[PDB]
Design a binder for this molecule. Structure first.
Ligand SMILES: Nc1ncnc2c1ncn2[C@@H]1O[C@H](COP(=O)(O)OP(=O)(O)OP(=O)(O)O)[C@@H](O)[C@H]1O
Ligand SMILES: Nc1ncnc2c1ncn2[C@@H]1O[C@H](COP(=O)(O)OP(=O)(O)O)[C@@H](O)[C@H]1O
Ligand SMILES: Nc1ncnc2c1ncn2[C@@H]1O[C@H](COP(=O)(O)OP(=O)(O)O)[C@@H](O)[C@H]1O
Ligand SMILES: [Mg+2]
Lengths: 48, 1056, 96
């Protein structure tokens, strides 16, 4: 589209990513997982 | 069936035809010069209609198949099928609910991805069909006639067990006699049946419709046989009284002819016992005179309303003429008693005390099996049919088959069906081709021995050789089961119940000098049959009995005239390959006379000279098409010699010729009266018979004929729907269809699909399946049963597709060196020549396609230089690849458009013509062209190399161009070698340059001796281009279609 | 046609319809071998026919003729036609 390339679910309307486990990924030595930081980026800014 | 509720769709054609109108309207907008500013909206509507068409054309499939497959899985629920069909049910009803919500037609373009939903529903329905195969074979073993219905209609009749539209649409193909039925006032019973012309016979009792389909089809079979049986008894019971039971509305012709023959038989066997009795001969003469007199009471009204069955009279005259000849020969020999074999030679139709017929020849007897035939064309009793009938009846007495044979075009195929008509059986004419499975022949045999029908296996010769060997064991098993009066035979494992009134015959030709590819039959297999000679029929007897039957009075003179015309015209006129004077041309001319006398009594009055004047036009509606010029003139001179002053009358109609000249005027051709004559001629032939050959050389105007008659007819006539095959490009099993060998699954083909599409269409259509390709017998003989007097196309599975009175096949071709004369005598013909073509009439339209900046000089130079240089090249004839005239013309012309002056036009003419010669003649071609031009160049030595420049007006200097860019880095690739520009390479490039530019899209082929410089120079000319994409494919002795198709499809888009 | 004389001979010398026969064609060879073995065990007769079409089958036939262990009163009847490229080995081991 306009304003940058985008992803859209094929042949459906509401794609659902069902993440199985959230406690289980790995901290670094400060306390911040890159996974939960990435999903924070997505659920706040709708992109990456 | 289960009480659900649903909304459904109808009136599809109303929606689809608007879409087709809109797409062709967009194509009409694509020709406007202002399309460049409005292209972008056209792209929208293009893609929109392209989606919507496929969506509708899938949804109608899904609707029809869902309606079919609801009741079957509803009634006999097996859950492994039920889960499948429930998922398909959910996926369909979910779409149809959203259509019930919004019914705007462009919502299907904007639903939630329906494309994969539709394709998956179609695929799952295909899979539940493959699950239903086993149940289909169960019901085919249940009711015997179903082996010739396809699956596609059989599951309809199983499902739609109450729908009247289904019954009237598919009961015709089951019982061949009944064309349609009626219904009572609540659609719960069937009370009557129809015919093709509308002969109506009521049933003696109503027929209860129900769900279990065999439990009322059995009722149809029994109640039809009982109805005809009681109707025959009632007719004969009134007829053996003293007064006549003449009331031809009250009975079908099948009972009239039979009652007259039975009463004739019993009266003559009283006669020869009592007395010679010329009284009975006089009685038959006066009775025949009475019928011919009453025939003039229906002929003058003709087309009335609720009055037909003049045909019941004409189907009675012939039997009366047969009885006349029998009594006259019994008078000529003066037979004493009944046991004298000159009476028992003649065919006898007795009555049994159980009131049913028993057809009895010499000692063998059979039974009448009450098949309702309706109106059909019977035959004239020539004395060859005596031979045929006695051989076949003695062979059936000995428990064997019958194999009539002889040359092409006699009557052996229809003689078997005529015997089946006179006996009361049903006949299922087949075709035998392609080498089908012995199990595939086995199931056909199972159907024939369960029903009780005569397989008339037409073309049993051309069949694969070992299949004949296994079939021999099969036939021997069946004939043993017949001769020992067995009730239970056994082939292919099962205990198939064989019928006592069964029978098998074949028909074939001997594999003579020109009957194509046919394999010789085994000796064992020949020992099972009984051969009959059917070589020569008569020609005077048939032609006089037909004309005397068809109301014409003077048959005894004119029939001999016809036969003498046939014999002289076949005998003295020059023997071309493609002529014919068989029995089929005669049978055509007789109906061509019957139609004209059918018009000229209900439309006027009758008199003397017109009755012998008609037959000249009714003969020249056929015979004029075949001829050349001079042979047609000599044929006219022969027509003058047989008929002294009754010479000529021309084409009656002209209002179609106005539209034809209109359509020529539209498409910017020229207007030639010869093309007009040939097109009107083609319309005559297409009205006359089933198939037309258009013989002609290359490019000489034999496809534009039908191409323009299409539009010229379609402007007034209904619909001309064209389907175009080319039968040699694709393989055989895709063309005619074939069977998967292990699965036993009928794959469809191209023209089987086209035949289904044409028999779908309503009665106000016309369609021309066109096979624009060359002719081999081993496929074109597969259409003998279509191009027959019968009209039927057969699958190797046993499925048989009829045709109505609409369809024509048009066969554009090159020559008929390789076609057997069965097909040549089978279909109509149009001839063309190399004398009728007008070269100037094709030069003028090409000149009319010129942009008006050079046309003065071009016409002034063509009109005095072109014809000499063309005729000199046709005089030399040393040209290396063989072309026709049209080809030489186009090779001359396509190197011209854009000449400036005279001296340039000379050289363009030389490069146009002399490319096809060789070097022994090209030099003196150049010598005569420059000498009979203005002047000579300074290229007097080797004049093949004249370089006309536009810049100075230079004529000729051959100069060598030496490169100076030479390292070893050029030679790095083995290809892309540095081309040294020698004068011959410059001549090649000067040849190539006019045709590879972006204004002349021309295909062309170089000729060179092997290893000479073709590929290098053509790659150089590829490299001179601008925005091309070269894709070289090396062909060899194995290269087929799919190899070039994938070499294309690797580097080519697919846009819809 | 030898078939009628063979049929009358099988009706004369034997009873109960022991006579069994198979023609040679497309799709009959692999059941022909089974019937060969079964009627070799039973001692009943066997009439093969048209051994001039299936020319690339006869090595299997001569292998099975060499291999089998027949019984008494077994009689194998052949029927072939004149044909070039025939196999010598069964021509050795037959009457003609
Ligand atoms: N009335 C006409 N005036 C001028 N040219 C015509 C006319 N009718 C047809 N032609 C030309 O004749 C050429 C060949 O036409 P047509 O395809 O019918 O010949 P053909 O023999 O069918 O070709 P093929 O040899 O490929 O079968 C066409 O290029 C067409 O331009
Ligand atoms: N005795 C006959 N009376 C009238 N028409 C006949 C007779 N015999 C043959 N015909 C016509 O000749 C045509 C060809 O007959 P057919 O049996 O197809 O011969 P073939 O199989 O050799 O072409 C048919 O249309 C048939 O109507
Ligand atoms: N004018 C020329 N100058 C130099 N070499 C040439 C010339 N004409 C032909 N050749 C040589 O002849 C060969 C011709 O190959 P070509 O004829 O294209 O093969 P094919 O006949 O298989 O298409 C080229 O490889 C080239 O080396
Ligand atoms: Mg053409």
């Amino acid at each position: 589209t306009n304003t940058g390339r985008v992803y859209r679910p094929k042949d459906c309307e509401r794609l659902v990513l069902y993440l199985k486990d959230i406690n289980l990924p790995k901290l670094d030595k400060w306390g911040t997982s890159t996974l939960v930081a990435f999903l924070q980026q997505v659920l706040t800014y709708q992109g990456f | 069936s289960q009480s659900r509720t649903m909304k459904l769709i109808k009136d599809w054609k109303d929606i689809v035809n608007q879409v087709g109108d809109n797409r062709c309207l967009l194509q009409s907008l694509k020709d406007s010069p202002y399309y460049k500013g409005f292209e972008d909206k056209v792209s929208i509507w293009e893609r929109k209609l392209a989606e919507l068409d496929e969506y509708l054309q899938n949804l109608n499939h899904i609707q029809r198949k869902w309606v079919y497959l609801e009741p079957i899985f509803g009634r006999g629920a097996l859950p492994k099928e039920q889960t499948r069909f429930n998922r398909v049910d959910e996926d369909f009803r979910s779409i149809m609910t959203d259509i019930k919500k919004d019914n705007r037609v462009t919502t299907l373009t904007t639903h939630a991805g329906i494309r994969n939903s539709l394709l998956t529903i179609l695929d799952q329905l295909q899979r539940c069909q493959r699950s239903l195969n086993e149940f289909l074979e169960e019901k085919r073993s249940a009711f015997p006639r179903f082996y010739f219905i396809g699956d596609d209609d059989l599951l309809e009749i199983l499902g739609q067990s109450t729908n009247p539209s289904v019954i009237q649409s598919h009961l015709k193909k089951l019982f061949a006699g009944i064309n349609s039925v009626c219904f009572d006032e609540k659609s719960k019973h069937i009370t009557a049946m129809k015919s093709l012309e509308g002969e109506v016979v009521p049933f003696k009792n109503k027929v209860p419709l129900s769900n279990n389909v065999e439990t009322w089809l059995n009722d149809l079979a029994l109640e039809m046989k009982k109805t005809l049986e009681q109707l025959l008894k009632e007719c004969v019971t009134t007829g053996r009284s003293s007064q006549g039971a003449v009331d031809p509305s009250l009975f079908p012709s099948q009972i009239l002819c039979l009652a007259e023959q039975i009463k004739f038989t019993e009266d003559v066997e009283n006669a020869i016992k009592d007395h010679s009795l010329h009284q009975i001969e006089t009685q038959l003469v006066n009775k025949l005179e009475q019928y011919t007199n009453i025939d003039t009471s229906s002929e003058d009204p003709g087309n009335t309303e609720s009055g037909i069955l003049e045909l019941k009279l004409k189907a009675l005259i012939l039997d009366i003429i047969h009885n006349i000849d029998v009594v006259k020969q019994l008078n000529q020999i003066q037979v004493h008693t009944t046991e004298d074999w000159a009476w028992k030679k003649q065919l006898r139709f007795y009555m049994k005390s159980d009131h049913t017929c028993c057809v009895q020849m010499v000692d063998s007897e059979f039974q009448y099996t009450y098949e309702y035939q309706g109106n059909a064309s019977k035959l004239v009793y020539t004395p060859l049919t005596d031979k045929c009938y006695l051989t076949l009846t003695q062979a059936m007495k000995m428990g064997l088959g019958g194999n009539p044979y002889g040359p092409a075009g006699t009557g052996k195929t229809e003689s078997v069906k005529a015997l089946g008509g006179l006996l009361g059986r049903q006949v299922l004419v087949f075709n035998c081709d392609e080498g089908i499975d012995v199990k595939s022949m086995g199931r056909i045999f199972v159907g024939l021995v369960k029903c009780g029908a005569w397989g008339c296996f037409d073309e049993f010769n051309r069949l694969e050789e070992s299949v004949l060997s296994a079939v021999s064991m099969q036939i021997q098993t069946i004939q043993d089961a017949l001769k020992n009066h067995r009730t239970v035979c056994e082939l292919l494992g099962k205990e198939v119940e064989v019928n006592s009134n069964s029978g098998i015959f074949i028909t074939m030709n001997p594999a003579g000098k020109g009957y194509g590819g046919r394999q010789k039959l085994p000796d064992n297999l020949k020992q099972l049959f009984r051969p009959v000679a059917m070589s020569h029929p008569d020609n005077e007897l048939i032609a006089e009995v037909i004309l005397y039957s068809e109301g014409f009075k003077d048959a005894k003179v004119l029939s001999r005239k016809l036969v003498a015309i046939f014999n002289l015209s076949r005998e003295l006129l020059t023997p071309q390959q493609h002529y014919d004077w068989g029995l089929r041309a005669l049978k055509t001319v007789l109906r061509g006379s019957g139609n004209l006398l059918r018009q000229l009594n209900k439309s006027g009055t009758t008199q003397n000279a017109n009755e012998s004047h008609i037959v000249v036009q009714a003969l020249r509606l056929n015979t004029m098409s075949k001829f050349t010029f001079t042979d047609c003139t000599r044929f006219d001179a022969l027509i003058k010699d047989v008929f002294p002053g009754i010479e000529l009358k021309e084409v009656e109609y002209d209002e179609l010729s106005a539209a034809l000249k209109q359509v020529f005027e539209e498409a910017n051709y020229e207007i030639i009266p010869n093309q007009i004559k040939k097109a009107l001629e083609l319309y005559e032939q297409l009205c006359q018979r089933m198939g037309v050959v258009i013989v002609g050389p290359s490019g000489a105007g034999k496809s534009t004929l039908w191409r323009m008659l299409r539009a010229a007819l379609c402007k007034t006539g209904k619909v001309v729907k064209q389907y175009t095959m080319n039968p040699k490009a694709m393989p055989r099993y895709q063309l005619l269809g074939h069977i998967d060998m292990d699965t036993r699954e009928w794959s469809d083909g191209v023209l089987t699909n086209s035949a289904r599409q044409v028999v779908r269409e309503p009665q106000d259509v016309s369609s021309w399946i066109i096979c624009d390709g060359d002719i081999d017998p081993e496929w074109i003989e597969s259409l003998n049963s279509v191009l027959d007097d019968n009209r039927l196309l057969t699958m190797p599975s046993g499925e048989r597709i009829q045709f109505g009175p609409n369809v024509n096949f048009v066969f554009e071709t090159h020559d008929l060196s390789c076609a057997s004369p069965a097909t040549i005598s089978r279909m109509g013909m149009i001839f063309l020549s190399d004398e009728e073509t007008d070269l100037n009439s094709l030069i003028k339209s090409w000149l009319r396609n010129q942009p008006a900046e050079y046309r003065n000089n071009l016409e002034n130079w063509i009109g005095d230089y072109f014809e000499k240089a063309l005729q000199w090249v046709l005089k030399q004839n040393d040209y290396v690849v063989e072309t026709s005239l049209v080809g030489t013309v186009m090779n001359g012309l396509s190197h011209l458009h854009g000449c400036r002056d005279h001296d340039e036009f000379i050289i363009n003419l030389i490069r146009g013509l002399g490319g096809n010669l060789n070097m022994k003649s090209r030099l003196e071609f150049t010598k005569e062209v420059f000498h009979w031009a203005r002047e000579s160049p300074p290229d007097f030595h080797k004049p093949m190399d004249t370089y006309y420049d536009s810049t100075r007006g230079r004529l000729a200097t051959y100069v060598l161009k030496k490169p100076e860019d030479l390292t070893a880095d050029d030679f790095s690739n083995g290809l892309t070698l540095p081309v040294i520009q020698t004068p011959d390479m410059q001549r090649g490039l000067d040849y190539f340059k006019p045709w590879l530019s972006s204004d002349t899209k021309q295909p062309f082929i170089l000729v060179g001796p092997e290893g000479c410089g073709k590929g290098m120079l053509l790659r150089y000319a590829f490299s001179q281009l601008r925005s091309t994409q070269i894709a070289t494919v090396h062909c060899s002795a194995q290269t087929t279609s799919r190899h070039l198709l994938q070499k294309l499809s690797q580097t080519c888009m697919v846009i819809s | 046609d030898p078939s009628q004389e063979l049929q009358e001979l099988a009706n004369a010398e034997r009873s109960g319809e022991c006579y069994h026969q198979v023609a040679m064609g497309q799709g009959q060879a692999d059941l022909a071998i089974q019937m060969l073995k079964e009627c070799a065990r039973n001692g009943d007769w066997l009439c093969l026919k048209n051994l001039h079409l299936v020319v690339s089958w006869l090595p299997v036939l001569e292998k099975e003729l060499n291999t089998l262990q027949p019984k008494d009163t077994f009689r194998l009847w052949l029927t072939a036609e004149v044909h070039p490229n025939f196999t010598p080995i069964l021509l050795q081991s037959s009457l003609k």
